Amino acid sequence: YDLINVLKHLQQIFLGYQSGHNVLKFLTKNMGELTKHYRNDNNANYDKLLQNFELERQSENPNNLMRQLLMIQFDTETLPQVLSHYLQIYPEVAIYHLKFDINIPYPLNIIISRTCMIKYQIILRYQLVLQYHSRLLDETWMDLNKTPSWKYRGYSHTVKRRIVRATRVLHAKMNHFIKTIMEYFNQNVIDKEVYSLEKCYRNPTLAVAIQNELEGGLTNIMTN
């Protein structure tokens, strides 16, 4: 079956394993409609994004069956709302409701259980939303440093301080914090799990142990 390639593909899909260019590719164009869905009704033109994704699936690798089987659905419930059922996660006392899933054939479905798919789905939504916001901030930085209105001269120190430097000081702090979180999540959480799984393929003796680790890692991520 080549389960290793299959799981590597699954990791490429939901954990962003070696997928930085794919997440940025996903955001490319799509961010334009993504910002509208929490500013619209459930009658929103979800189809436009779904078509963009379908078109990407047309322009796809013939062997990467895991991408071929990948689909996007929309919920009405955004991450913090759906996550309200988790005992450790507190609700607001709502931005994205985009979710991915995969239809798995029985030879694999017995491994790739619905429980792991749900965990993969929710983990990816976290990763995507964080990447989304991180990207908006990065593009904002480039807009700041490209746009002529942001490069004014000879007005006052009051404005150079209150508008330009103030923007850069806040922007940089926003950037340092959001990026450091992303770095943590990958470096000290996801990389460990991908690594652990690689360790478990070192001439494993038990199918179950592998299954337990797949679930193990997903929980380790979710309880972080």
Partner: protein, 441 residues
């Protein structure tokens, strides 16, 4: 996200051929454009696309243009490697010439034929998928740098106003010629300072100090050290080429490397390797100024921004421990509360970690205050000679030809722009520089 590299004269093209060779090796893509990988698989874990164009016959050439005023240099690379270059995208100067190693020379070639260099650049962009910012390498003072590299930045700003301009700057005159090259350096910096979005400086002393310790021929200076510098300038795209997740693009990295763009030049630090160990030590080893690329006496500098990518047999627990010197050793950005950022892994699979290896290598770069030692050399030199009448009156080409008045004004205004860069390096480390930004708000 495609990148096209613009290679200026001997600086750009020699390092370029050494780099494309290093990449030819890292991707097993071939110094002759023929993949070195077996045909046993149609799948890959890398991404050559952004730097190399794949042909219909699975042959490859780099996304690069060699600079036009120095056809003998262009020929050196195109003829030595050939199969791994595409000469049809190369512009050659309209007069087949370079009128001296000066700003006026290349600047005039550029302004006179701005449209022709752009037509070659623009046509290649149309053949690629989503062009990502321009990559330029040059000697700031030279004919292809102070002259044409300066013109390219101006040309690119108007033709491609929506794209990122990133450059590599190498050290200014290393000899008494500085009384001439420092003028070119300053005019060049005016353009680099006003037009680029980001850059970096590579000091001759490190090329040579490393040379003395790494080659068994310690008399090596700029040649051959070009390969050492090409392994240094690899860390810039490894996260793209051997893709990662954390920092996979230009717009996603520059906001982290230099939040305040006027101080556009980074200070690299790198441990050389052939083409020690622990994540803990490779990170810590790069805090030592002897591994820096702008070495000086300031063993206690302040920092505005520090970033590092470690590639190899990475251990996150060791990284956590290495962090102790972030807290103890980096003089804090009292003016902005920045902190160090990192990225990890993605060793080329075709140059894998060897059995029993736990070694790692990587690049630390920083926006450091005390980097004036690679700029003041020109600013505080050309001006004392300039004040007595410019020493470049034998380069009266184009704008310096049109009037002696332009000669003196271009040099003086450029010095003021450079002086702003020097003033900004210093002002930036003062707490009072930015505290008033949010207090009076």
């Amino acid at each position: 996200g495609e990148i096209i590299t613009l290679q200026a004269g001997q600086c750009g093209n020699h390092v370029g051929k050494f780099l494309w060779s290093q990449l030819a090796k890292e991707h097993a893509i071939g110094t002759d454009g023929l993949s070195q990988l077996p045909d046993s698989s149609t799948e890959r874990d890398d991404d050559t696309k952004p730097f190399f164009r794949e042909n219909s016959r699975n042959k490859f050439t780099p996304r690069a243009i060699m600079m036009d005023s120095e056809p003998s240099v262009i020929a050196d690379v195109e003829n030595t490697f050939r199969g791994f270059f595409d000469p049809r995208n190369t512009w050659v100067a309209s007069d087949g010439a370079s009128a001296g190693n000066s700003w006026a020379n290349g600047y005039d070639i550029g302004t006179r034929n701005q449209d022709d260099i752009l037509n070659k650049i623009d046509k290649e962009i149309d053949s690629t998928d989503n062009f990502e910012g321009f990559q330029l390498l040059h000697s700031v003072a030279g004919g292809t740098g102070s002259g044409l590299g300066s013109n390219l930045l101006e040309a690119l700003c108007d033709r491609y106003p929506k794209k990122i301009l990133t450059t590599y700057s190498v050290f200014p005159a290393r000899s008494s010629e500085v009384v001439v090259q420092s003028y070119n350096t300053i005019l060049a910096l005016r353009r680099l300072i006003e037009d680029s979005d980001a850059t970096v400086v590579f000091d001759n002393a490190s090329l040579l100090n490393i040379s003395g310790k790494v080659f068994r021929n310690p008399n090596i200076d700029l040649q051959h050290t070009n390969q050492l510098i090409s392994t240094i300038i690899s860390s810039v795209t490894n996260s793209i080429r051997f893709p990662s997740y954390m920092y996979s693009s230009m717009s996603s990295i520059y906001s982290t490397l230099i939040p305040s763009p006027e101080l556009h030049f980074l200070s690299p630090s790198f441990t050389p390797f052939t083409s020690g160990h622990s994540s803990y030590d490779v990170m810590l080893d790069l805090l030592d100024p002897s591994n820096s690329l702008v070495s000086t006496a300031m063993n206690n500098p302040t920092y505005f921004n520090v970033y590092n990518t470690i590639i190899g047999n990475v251990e996150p627990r060791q990284i956590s421990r290495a962090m102790t010197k972030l807290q103890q050793r980096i003089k804090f950005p009292s003016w902005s509360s920045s902190a160090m950022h990192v990225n990890i892994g993605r060793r080329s699979p075709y140059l894998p970690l060897q059995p029993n290896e736990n070694e790692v290598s990587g690049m630390m770069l920083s926006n450091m205050s005390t980097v004036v030692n690679v700029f003041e050399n020109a600013c505080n030199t050309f001006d004392k000679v300039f004040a007595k009448g410019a020493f470049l009156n034998n380069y009266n080409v184009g704008d310096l030809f049109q009037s002696m008045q332009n000669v003196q004004d271009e040099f003086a205004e450029s010095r003021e722009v450079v002086q702003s860069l020097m003033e900004d390096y210093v002002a930036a480390e003062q707490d009072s520089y930015l505290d008033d930004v949010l207090v009076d708000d």
